[PDB]
Subunit: 309 residues, 5 copies
C-alpha cells in the first residue's frame, strides 16, 4: 500500500555556524522520486514543469507530498522547484534549498572540538503506511583546498532511514503513529590553525613572561610589576572574548585565562610573603629564587592535569 | 453554542533571549482540533490537505479560525500547514512556527536570575460565545545535557485557560466581549557557572589584589600604584560590558565593579590621609597597616550586606 | 458627504529606539469603523472575514480604504487582519501591526532625555471631502513594574485630529487638497539609573582621583603620573563610547570625558610650569599644594556652568 | 508619438549612510502622470484604485509602465500603491517607497566631507520613442533643526532629464536604444560636531602632552615615559576605529593618529641619542630643553603640509 | 534540434565581500534570447510583457526556461522582469538581479590579495540536448575614481561556455546527462591604502621601538619596561583583530604580531640572561649593546622569511 519514495540530497556548502544558537547553514539540492498512476504527456517524452507551474498541477489534483526538514530553524529558502512527470507513472521533485539547521553542539573543547552537521527529513502529513523512504543517497563535493576552509570535512556522509513513534497524537490509534525519517550525518573537525598561533601561543608567552617577576630583585619592583602583569591579562581576556565565539560555558582558552589570573594573584601573595616570612624582617630569598622554578613548574604541573574532557 | 477547540503545542527549542527587548525565540508545532459539519471524503478515510491548498478550501467555505499568538513580536515564521479533514466532522489544523515572544523579564539578579518563558494564544476574531478553548496540552523535551545548555528548565510546562474581558470594544454589548485565552508558562533558572568562573572570580582576584597597595612602603609607591589599579578596573568594566548582556539597570557584577572603583578611591583617600595626619611629618604607619585588614574586612563586611533583593 | 471613520489604536510595546536613525518600534492593533450600504448577512448576526478572505471581498467591490502610517519607515509587518461586516451597514477593520516609526528625537540631554513617540495616521487616497476621521482613542497598557523597563511612559497618550494642506497636487481643485490626520503622542523619559551608577559615578571618581596628582612630592613623580591618568581617560572614553548610543552630537557623558582630558592637560601644564616658574629651577611648591584644592573647586566651578540646554 | 510622463518625487527621510558600500537610504513617494485612451468611470468623477487592485486592471490591458530606480540596490520596499484614473484619459500612479540607493561617495575629508544623494529614474522597458519624461519635480522638507541631525542638507534638490544610449542592445537598429532618465541630486554636508569635540580635540591634547616628555630631567624618566605615551596612541587608535566609519582609505583623524605615532617615535629616537651624542657619556642637555620648543614647532610645521585634497 | 539561448550579463556593482562565508554581492541585469514559433503580435511590432504579466503567458503555455545561478547563496532578489516577444519567433528575457555569490576565496596574503568574482550560470531543468548557450557577453562599468573604492577591478571579465557531466542521474541513459554552463570571471585586487598607513606602519614603529629596550642602562629598567612593551602588543593585537576581517587562518599581519610577541619574549630572556651569565654578578654589558642591533636585524630577518606563498 505505501508509496516508496527515493531521496537524494546534494550538499553544496556548509557554513555560518552559530555557536550560541547551535545552528549551521546548508545549501544544497533535494531530489525525491516516487511512482503513481501513469499519465498522458505531450509526446512520449517526459514533461517538465517548473516553479509556479507546479502549483497548477497540484490544483488539478497532482499528488506532491510535503517533505519537512525536522531540524531546520525557520522556513528554508527555496530556490528553483521542478517536477518531472514520466508517462509510466513516476514523478521526480527537484528543488534547491538554503536553510539553517539545528543540532546539539558541544563547543567545550574549543578550538579542538569535533562537530557533526545533521539533516533530518520526514514527511509532514503522511505516516509510513502511506509514504515510506525506500533509500537515501547523499553526495558531497571533494574539497581539495580544504586548508582554506573554516571546517574540514572528515569522511563521507552517513545515512539512516528509520521510523519515529509519536505517542502524543490527536489522530487515531492502530499503527498510525509512525513516520519514515531520513537522517543525514556529516562529521567535521574545526580548523585549529588560527587559534593555536594567534591565541594559544601568545597567551602562553604572556603567562610565562609573568613568571619572570621573581627575577626582579626588589620587593617594590616585584609587587608593582605584577599589577602591570594583572592589567595585561585583563587586556588579554578582552582580546580573546571579543574575537572568539560566545558560549554559555568556559572553553580551554577561557580556562587558561582564568589560570593566568590565578598565577599572578598567587605570585602577588608569595612576593608579599617572602617579605615577611622570616624573623629579622629579612627577605627569605630562599623562597623567591626557588620561585624562579617553583612557578614555572608548579603551575605547569598542577596545570598539566587539565585532562577535563 | 460555542465550538470547543483543543490545542496541543509541541515546543522544540527556546533560544535566543534578547535582554534589552525582553523577548525570546520559540520553535515548535501548534495543533488545533474542533468538530464541524460531517463530510464526504474520498474513501471513508480522512483527507489530508497541505500548504497552499488550505486556502482553496477556505474559499469554498471551510472554517479555519485565525488563532493569534497574543504576545508574539512580528508575524511568526510559519512552515508547513496541514489540515486533516475527518468524515465524522472533525478538523485538525497542524502548523509549524518560529517566533519571537515577549514577556516581562527581570534580569536584575544576573547571573543568578530566574525567568519564565510564556506563550499566550487567543482567537483573533471570535469570542467565547463562538469559540472556546476546551483544553491545552504542552509537550517539551526533557533536557539532561543541561550542562552545555545555558538554561535549566524547572519542570514540565504549566498552563491556564481563562476568559478575557475587553473594556473598549466597538462591537456590541451582551456577553460578547470576552475571549478565550490559553497561557503556557515554562520556568527556568540560569546556569551561573560561566559567569562565576570567568567574570565573578577574576573580578574578585583583581579587587583583592587591589588591597595589596598597603604593603607598599613609601607613600609614593602607594599613591602612584593605585592609579594603575584604577586603570585595571576600567579595563575590566570594558571587558565585562562588551560581552555581558545589555540592560537598563545594574546587575550584581555591575555593582562589584562599582565597588572596585570605590575601594580604590577610598584607598587613595586613605593613602593620602595617613601621609599628612600627624605632626613631625612622620608617616602615620598606624593608620596604614590596620588598613591591611580594614579593607579586606570592611569591603568584605560592608559587602556581605548587599541584601537588596 | 464625507465618510466618517472612527479609529482606535492599542499600543502593546514600544521598544528598539534607534538614535542615529531617530526611529522606534511599535507593536499594536488598529481598529477602524465606518458605515456603508446595509447588507444581508448569514443570519442577522455580523459576518467575520479574516485575512486572505478580506482580499476576495475587495475584488468583488467592497470599499476598504487603505490607511497609511505617515511616519512609518518601511512597509510595516501586518499580522492577522479582520473585517467584521454588520447587517446595518457598518464595517470594522482590525489589524495587528509592528512597524518602525520616525520622529524628531533630541538626545542631547542623555541620559536624562525626554522623547515622545508619535504615530501619525492618514488616508492614502481620500481627502476630507471624501473621508475624514471623526474621533481618536488610544489605549496603552499600564506597566506597573516600569523599573525593569528602559523607558518610563509618562502620562496617557494625547491625541489630535487635524487637517493637512498639500500645496503641490496634480489632482483637482475645489476643496480637494486637504486630508484628515490622526496624531498620537506618547511622552517618555529615560531610565537614568545604569548610566548614573555605572558611567557617571566612576567617571567622577576617576576625574577626582586625578586631582591627587598634586599630592605627589617629586616633580618627576607628578609629571610621569599624569600620563597614566591620561591613559585612564582614553580607556574610559572607549568604554563609554562602545556601550552608549551613537549620536552626531555630544552628551553630558561625552562632555565630562572631555573635561577629564582637560583637567589632566591643565595639570600637566602647571606641574611643568611650577618646575620652572621661579628662579633656581626650584620646584615652585607655592603653586602646587594650593592646586590641591584649587582644581577640586575650579573644575567644580567652571564645570558647574554646563547649563548648555 | 512617445508618451509624455510627468514625475514628482517627494522625499521624506534620507538616512543610514553605509560608507563602505557607498549607499544611503531614502524614504519617499513617487508620482507619475500620463495620458491614455479616455475611459468610462463611475460618475463623471475620477476613479481611485489602491494596492492589490492595480494588478487586476493590468490584466484587462491597462498600460502601467515600469519605472525603475537605476541606482537602487535590491528591490525597494514599496508601501501603498495607487492609480488615479480620470475619465478624460489621464492616469496617475502614486507610490510610497523605501530603498537603498547607490552613488559615488568620497569620505577622504571626513568628518568634514560633503556628499550628494542621488536618485536615478528610467523606464525599464520603453525607450524615448515610446516613453519620455516631460518633467521632474522634487520636493523636500524645510529642516530647521539640523543641529540634531547627522547630515545638513545644503540647498534644494536639482533635477535632470536626459537620454541614455545603450549601445549593446539585442534589439533592432533605428533609435530604439535610447532611454529617457530623470536624475535627482541632493547635496549634503556632515555635522562635524561630535567628531570635533570628542575625537579631534582630545587627540591633539594627547599629542600636545606627548611633547612634554622633554621636560623630564633624567634620561631614564624620558625613555620609560615614552612607552606609556606610545600605548596611549594605540589606545586612541582603537577608540576611534571602533566608532568611526570604516573606509578603505585614511582620513584626517586617521592621519592625526599616524602623525601622533611619529611624534612619539621621533621623540624616542632623539631621547635615545641625546644620551649618547657626545663623548663623556653626557646627556646632551644642549639638545634636549632646546627640544622643548623645537618639536612642538617641528611637528606642527611638518604637520602643516597635510594638504592632501 | 536543441534550442540556442544567447545570454548577455550587465554588471552594476560588486560589493559586500564576506570573508568567513567566502561570498560577495552582485547587482546586475541578465538578458537571454532564443527563437521559437512565430507569433501574432498586436501590430507587426514586438510585444512587451512586464512583471506580473509574464506568469499569465506561462499558464497559456509560453515556454520560458529557468536559468539558475549555480553558485548563488540563497534565492536572489529579482527586481523588474521583462519579456519582449518578437513576431518572427525570437524571445527576449530581461531581468534585474541582486544576489550573494560563492567562490573559493584565499585571504592569506591580506591586505594584498587578489580575488575572482565568479558567476556560474546554467539551466535548471533542460540538458544540452534540449537547451544550449550559444554565446555570452559580459559588460562592466568603467571606474575612473578607483582610489575611493574598496576593490580595484583588474581587467575585463573573462568568459567560457562549457559542458558538465553529472554522474548520479535517475533518468535514462543515452546522451541525456550533460548541461550547458556559462562561467563569468572578474579579477580584482584590494586597495591596501588604509591598511598600510594606519595598520602596517604603526606596527613597524611599535615593533621597532620595542628594540629600544636594550638602550636602558639598568637591569630593573630593562626588565620592568619589557612588561609595558608586552601590554602594548596585546592592545595592538586587539586594535587589529577588531577591525581586520575575521578569518580561520593567519595573515601576514597576524604573523608580524606573533613575531612581535616573539621579539619581546626573546628580549625578556636575553635581558634576564645577560644579568646572570657571568660570575660575581658583573652585568654582561657586551650581550646587551650587541643587542641594540642584534634584534633589529634578527627579527627583521626571521620576519623577512615569511615568504610562505
Ligand atoms: F599604567 C600605565 F600608566 O603605565 C604602564 Cl601601562 C604600567 F601599566 F606598566 F604601569
Ligand atoms: F592597554 C590595553 F591593553 O588595555 C587598555 Cl587599552 C588600557 F590601556 F586601559 F589598559
Amino acid at each position: 500500500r505505501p508509496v516508496d519514495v527515493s531521496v537524494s540530497i546534494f550538499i553544496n556548502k556548509i557554513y555560518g555556524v552559530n555557536t550560541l544558537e547551535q545552528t549551521y547553514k546548508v545549501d544544497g539540492y533535494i531530489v525525491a522520486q516516487w511512482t503513481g498512476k501513469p499519465r498522458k504527456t505531450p509526446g512520449d517524452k517526459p514533461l517538465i514543469v517548473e516553479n509556479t507551474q507546479i502549483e497548477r498541477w497540484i490544483n488539478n489534483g497532482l499528488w506532491v507530498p510535503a517533505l519537512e526538514f525536522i531540524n531546520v530553524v525557520g522556513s528554508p529558502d527555496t530556490g528553483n522547484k521542478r517536477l518531472m512527470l514520466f508517462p509510466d507513472g513516476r514523478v521526480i521533485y527537484n528543488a534547491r534549498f538554503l536553510g539553517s539547521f539545528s543540532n546539539d553542539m558541544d563547543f567545550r573543547l574549543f578550538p579542538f572540538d569535533r562537530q557533526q552537521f545533521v539533516l533530518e527529513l520526514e514527511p509532514f502529513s503522511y505516516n509510513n503506511q502511506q509514504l515510506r523512504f525506500s533509500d537515501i543517497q547523499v553526495y558531497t563535493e571533494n574539497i581539495d583546498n580544504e586548508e582554506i576552509d573554516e571546517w574540514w570535512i572528515r569522511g563521507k556522509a552517513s545515512t539512516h532511514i528509520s521510523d519515529i513513534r509519536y505517542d502524543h497524537l490527536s489522530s487515531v490509534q492502530p499503527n498510525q503513529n509512525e513516520f519514515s525519517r531520513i537522517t543525514v550525518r556529516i562529521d567535521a573537525v574545526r580548523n585549529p590553525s588560527y587559534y593555536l598561533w594567534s591565541f594559544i601561543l601568545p597567551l602562553g608567552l604572556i603567562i610565562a613572561a609573568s613568571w619572570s617577576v621573581f627575577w626582579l630583585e626588589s620587593f617594590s619592583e616585584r609587587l608593582q610589576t605584577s599589577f602591570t602583569l594583572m592589567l595585561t591579562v585583563v587586556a588579554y581576556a578582552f582580546y580573546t572574548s571579543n574575537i572568539l565565539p560566545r558560549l554559555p560555558y568556559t572553553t580551554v582558552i577561557d580556562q587558561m585565562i582564568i589560570a593566568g589570573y590565578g598565577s599572578i594573584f598567587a605570585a602577588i601573595l608569595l612576593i608579599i610573603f617572602a617579605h615577611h616570612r622570616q624573623a629579622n624582617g629579612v627577605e627569605d630569598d630562599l623562597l623567591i629564587q626557588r620561585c624562579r622554578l617553583a612557578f614555572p613548574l608548579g603551575f605547569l604541573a598542577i596545570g598539566c592535569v587539565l585532562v577535563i574532557r
